[PDB]
Amino acid sequence: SGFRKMAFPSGKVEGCMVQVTCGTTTLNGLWLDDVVYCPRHVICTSEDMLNPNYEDLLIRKSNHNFLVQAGNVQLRVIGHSMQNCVLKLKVDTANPKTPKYKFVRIQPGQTFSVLACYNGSPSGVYQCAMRPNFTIKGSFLNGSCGSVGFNIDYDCVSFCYMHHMELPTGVHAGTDLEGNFYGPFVDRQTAQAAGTDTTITVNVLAWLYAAVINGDRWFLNRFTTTLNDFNLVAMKYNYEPLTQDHVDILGPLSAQTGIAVLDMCASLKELLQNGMNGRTILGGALLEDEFTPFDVVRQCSGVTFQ
Amino acid sequence: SGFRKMAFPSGKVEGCMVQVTCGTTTLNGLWLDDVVYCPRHVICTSEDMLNPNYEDLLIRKSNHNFLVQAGNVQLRVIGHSMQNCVLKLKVDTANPKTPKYKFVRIQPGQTFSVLACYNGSPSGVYQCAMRPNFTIKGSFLNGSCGSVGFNIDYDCVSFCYMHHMELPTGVHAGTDLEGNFYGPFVDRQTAQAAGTDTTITVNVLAWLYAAVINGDRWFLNRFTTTLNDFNLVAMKYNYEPLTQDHVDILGPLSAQTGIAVLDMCASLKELLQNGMNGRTILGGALLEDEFTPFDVVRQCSGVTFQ
């Protein structure tokens, strides 16, 4: 038993983290096959980040201006290109530790594991979630740009996020592995407003189901609610509107615990209206929203990707 | 910026996780060099766990009764021995992915990363802490026995924990890699009382320093306290007594933020006596105690073990 915020094993990703140097700036790159992916603001300086003309800046750079170090190996760049906000540095040799991988663009509310790196070396791994405003609340210091988020499917690594910048409000923004930013963010040092953030309601319900599986049950009320009447309360507390697609997602969790989805929504409503009253759920005093229903089923059944 | 509960990269540990089968029971083993370490209750059944005579049970077993699978490789056991509560299965070939490693016995309050495994395959990684009562609050299902906790020091892996059993109260107990249990626990299915758990005070202060580094500052009071007068309040709220060794541990954190250790203790005292008043610290409403002062300095400076 027990429930933990759990990250994917990072072995298959560690072997792909390299160091990318261009001029004075260093950040992390992703070495898959014979291509190194890294944020395009590695060709910038601190003053360039204000109003960067990335096309004119990259034209100044040639093939031998990019220093790619893989642990103690250094790769020979035999081609470079700019795909949106990511740089594709064609290298000499293919990464022998290249895992089976895909590039995926996730949706708000989905979760993934982040391998925090500095100078191409993995520092740590933690789980996070794409906020509904396309930001993430991670831990990224200077030199952590290019750190990647991923999911594991048995043997296949689904790369979904690349860290690019810290917003002035302390939150983090990034792109997919095709260089397209999540949200309305641009790789430019300016005031960038992230929209109003809401709580992923379907994630909160999955985390309540996980609490029932583990014994914590004081929040199970004797009332119910409808889908509409719950959404009226959800809008008041900045919660995502629950759709029928979300209710069907919680089907398996509903089947295992014998508690209907609408019955758990009334428990959440009373948690929103009345609070927790000094009690805890799975050792916490806030409603956790960083576990998808697939995350809960994974930890509760013991899925082994190896 | 940002602060996350962060686990060590698990690459060096994944390559050492094997499957150990003896009779009907399966659990995870640790393959370092030519020795496989696994809990000794792999030679038991469900009824054996009541009153197990491990010496008489192991004597019934011979060398070819242990089925060790490493991914798709299966190893040839050429020797077996019982060191306390751990089994040492001498195998034919040495693990080619054996990292530089030590066996360490940690102290209560120290933290480590757990690689949750099932049938010898890594499921996920998360950070935890040795509670003052020598238990851990992890996520261990059936078949997760033999999962190991570890710390990374640059290139060296310090193995410190091996999971053995779930206590009836839902908490977890285990041994070091020499087979010696943490706490008064025995590998026997019975009622085993874990002592009163307290909060690691030195960890809470380190987590408050991390909050100051990240901007959250509303708890910084205009009062102070002495070491004794704080310990009187700490005993009332089930907090570990703060010693001079703990104050010196927080020295670097005190030097970076310009806040004396005793000044932060008065802030914690008012947090204990007055609560949080609906506010949050680093996105949480409870006083986190699973970050050692070394953990905070690590995440704040960007230490890369690779």
Numbering used by the authors:
A (entry chain A), B (entry chain A): 1 to 306
Please give me the paper's original passages concerning this structure.
SARS-CoV-2 Mpro is a cysteine protease that forms a dimer composed of two protomers. Mpro cleaves the polyproteins at 11 positions with a consensus cleavage sequence Leu Gln | (Ser, Ala, Gly) to release nsp’s, which are required to assemble the viral replication-transcription complex. In addition to the indispensable role in viral replication, SARS-CoV-2 Mpro also plays an essential role in escaping antiviral defense by cleaving host cell proteins.
Crystal structures of 11 Mpro mutants provided structural insight into their altered functionality. The crystal structures of several variants revealed the changes in side chains orientations of residues in the active site comprising substrate binding pockets, especially S2 and S4, which might lead to altered amino acids preferences. We observe the highest level of conformational plasticity around the S2′ and S3′ binding pockets with N142 and S46 being the most flexible residues within the structures we solved. This might explain why with most mutants we see the changes in binding affinities and not the kcat values.
